[PDB]
Amino acid sequence: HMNINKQSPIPIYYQIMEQLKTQIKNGELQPDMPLPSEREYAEQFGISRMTVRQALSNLVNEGLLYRLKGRGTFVSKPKMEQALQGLTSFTEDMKSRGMTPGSRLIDYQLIDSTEELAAILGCGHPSSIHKITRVRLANDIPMAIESSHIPFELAGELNESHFQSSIYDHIERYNSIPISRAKQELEPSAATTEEANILGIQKGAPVLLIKRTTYLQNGTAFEHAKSVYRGDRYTFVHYMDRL
Amino acid sequence: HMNINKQSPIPIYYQIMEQLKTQIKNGELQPDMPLPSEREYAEQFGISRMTVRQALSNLVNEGLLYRLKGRGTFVSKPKMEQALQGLTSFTEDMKSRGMTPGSRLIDYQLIDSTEELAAILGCGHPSSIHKITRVRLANDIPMAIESSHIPFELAGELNESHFQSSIYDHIERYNSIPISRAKQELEPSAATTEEANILGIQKGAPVLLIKRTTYLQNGTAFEHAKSVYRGDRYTFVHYMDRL
Numbered sequence: 001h002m003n004i005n006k007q008s009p010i011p012i013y014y015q016i017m018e019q020l021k022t023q024i025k026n027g028e029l030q031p032d033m034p035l036p037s038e039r040e041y042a043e044q045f046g047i048s049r050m051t052v053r054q055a056l057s058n059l060v061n062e063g064l065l066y067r068l069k070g071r072g073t074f075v076s077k078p079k080m081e082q083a084l085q086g087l088t089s090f091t092e093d094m095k096s097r098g099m100t101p102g103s104r105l106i107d108y109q110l111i112d113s114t115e116e117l118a119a120i121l122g123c124g125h126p127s128s129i130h131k132i133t134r135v136r137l138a139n140d141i142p143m144a145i146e147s148s149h150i151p152f153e154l155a156g157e158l159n160e161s162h163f164q165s166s167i168y169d170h171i172e173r174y175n176s177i178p179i180s181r182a183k184q185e186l187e188p189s190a191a192t193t194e195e196a197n198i199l200g201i202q203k204g205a206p207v208l209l210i211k212r213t214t215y216l217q218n219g220t221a222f223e224h225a226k227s228v229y230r231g232d233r234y235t236f237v238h239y240m241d242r243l
Numbered sequence: 244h245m246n247i248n249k250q251s252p253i254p255i256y257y258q259i260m261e262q263l264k265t266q267i268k269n270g271e272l273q274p275d276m277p278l279p280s281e282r283e284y285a286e287q288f289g290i291s292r293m294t295v296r297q298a299l300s301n302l303v304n305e306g307l308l309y310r311l312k313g314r315g316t317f318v319s320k321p322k323m324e325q326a327l328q329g330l331t332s333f334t335e336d337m338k339s340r341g342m343t344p345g346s347r348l349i350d351y352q353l354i355d356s357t358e359e360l361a362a363i364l365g366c367g368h369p370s371s372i373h374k375i376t377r378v379r380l381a382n383d384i385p386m387a388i389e390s391s392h393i394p395f396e397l398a399g400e401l402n403e404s405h406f407q408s409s410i411y412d413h414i415e416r417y418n419s420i421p422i423s424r425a426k427q428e429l430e431p432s433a434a435t436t437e438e439a440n441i442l443g444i445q446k447g448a449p450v451l452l453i454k455r456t457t458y459l460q461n462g463t464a465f466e467h468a469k470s471v472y473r474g475d476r477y478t479f480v481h482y483m484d485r486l
């Protein structure tokens with residue numbers, strides 16, 4: 001049950017919205033069962049129903065809750081289906097979903113090649129390697145953290161405008177060769193404290209750890225990326241044939 | 244950071260082995276850094292170096308640890324790669340890696356079809372559906388928990404001889420039609436208390452939640468399975484194409 005502090009400067013409706021949000025983040029409210037009623041909340045904390053109703057309606061207007069007639073109010077659990085077999089960019093993914101892709105830069109460095117990285121990319125050593133770490137956003141909501149390693153010569157000099165747009169698009173134009181094939185490795189994990197803060201989920205929340213090596217049509221590897229995708233807003237789908 | 248109790252009837256070497264195991268399963272120990280030396284352990288707990296050596300040697304022999312001539316003793320992180328595009332059985336997967344597949348029956352129930360399950364499987368409603376829940380073992384080590392829903396008339400009566408062998412082999416045999424295609428949905432999760440106890444991992448440890456819907460060559464779906472796969476023993480690998 002929530003913790004409501006009436007002597008706090010923070011308005012009670014706001015407390016409710018945040019506690020509820022926090023409760024949805026740590027799973028204490030699942031999407032199969034309805035929330036306590038307006039009346040139950042009010043009586044529980046000795047507060048007005050209109051205060052409860054203000055918090056709940058705001059959460060409905062955010063799309064965090066929904067009202068099913070005669071059944072109650074429920075936690076919304078929108079999932080995107082990520083097709084694993086089609087090589088696409090984040091930008092392409094969002095557009096196809098009628099959503100607006102965004103990025104926030106966590107870190108950029110141009111780093112020295114290592115024998116490990118050069119063997120993965122089949123690039124030169126010593127060489128310079130873009131290391132691009134971004135939060136990827138969908139309608140301003142963080143969906144993933146990606147850290148992409150790209151040999152300098154396959155991208156040339158990069159600036160903030162590149163980071164704010166599509167790296168795959170730049171890659172195809174800069175190289176005049178299409179992006180063709182990738183290998184991905186998937187591991188379930190728990191969000192670190194840092195990953196959780198950036199993603200707006202709980203410490204330890206479920207995430208998919210993804211390692212991708214991406215290739216141009218001519219067989220050249222241009223990317224080795226490691227990423228963390230939110231478990232709570234993604235389902236990953238693929239198909240299998242016999243033989 | 245182990246806990247050693249000298250007045251316990253349990254021998255100290257056994258405590259060390261168990262405490263270290265518990266540490267490897269809660270992440271206190273990591274495969275990157277060397278374990279503390281015999282000396283560090285012995286001095287810390289006020290015990291014999293040969294008691295420490297006995298525990299560490301046992302763990303090496305169990306595969307849980309390995310030694311390195313100049314760097315010291317390390318945590319083994321053996322992970323299987325699970326290829327995601329060929330449709331195969333557990334039994335097939337384990338044989339391919341030269342491991343012995345096994346099963347322990349968690350529960351079997353013949354259940355009434357639900358409208359939900361009937362839509363998924365495209366089977367009759369009312370009808371009867373096998374609900375087969377097994378721990379799947381690799382050399383007697385729990386790898387996964389699977390709960391497979393199979394329409395009764397696609398498998399007939401089932402007994403412990405079926406549960407202890409390959410369901411997919413039985414499915415092909417019984418129907419005289421081979422398995423051909425599947426859809427799979429992947430989701431990162433944390434092991435529930437019950438899932439963790441069965442898999443021998445920590446409560447809340449990372450697992451991949453997998454939903455598989457599997458089809459015969461004639462297009463009939465014979466299986467809807469929900470599974471939990473151990474994060475600590477599995478890497479999921481697939482390839483992508485630009486299409």
Ligand SMILES: CC(=O)N[C@@H]1[C@@H](O)[C@H](O)[C@@H](COP(=O)(O)O)O[C@@H]1O
Nearest residue numbers: 089090091166167168210212225227
């Ligand atoms: C899990 C994964 O590896 N996802 C890739 C990412 O590695 C790649 O860098 C990004 C480029 O997107 P962009 O073209 O929009 O910058 O597309 C995908 O999100």
Ligand SMILES: CC(=O)N[C@@H]1[C@@H](O)[C@H](O)[C@@H](COP(=O)(O)O)O[C@@H]1O
Nearest residue numbers: 332333334409410411453455468470
């Ligand atoms: C994640 C997943 O869906 N795994 C399937 C499982 O659904 C199927 O029931 C089992 C049959 O194996 P068997 O033929 O050895 O009994 O093979 C695979 O492990």
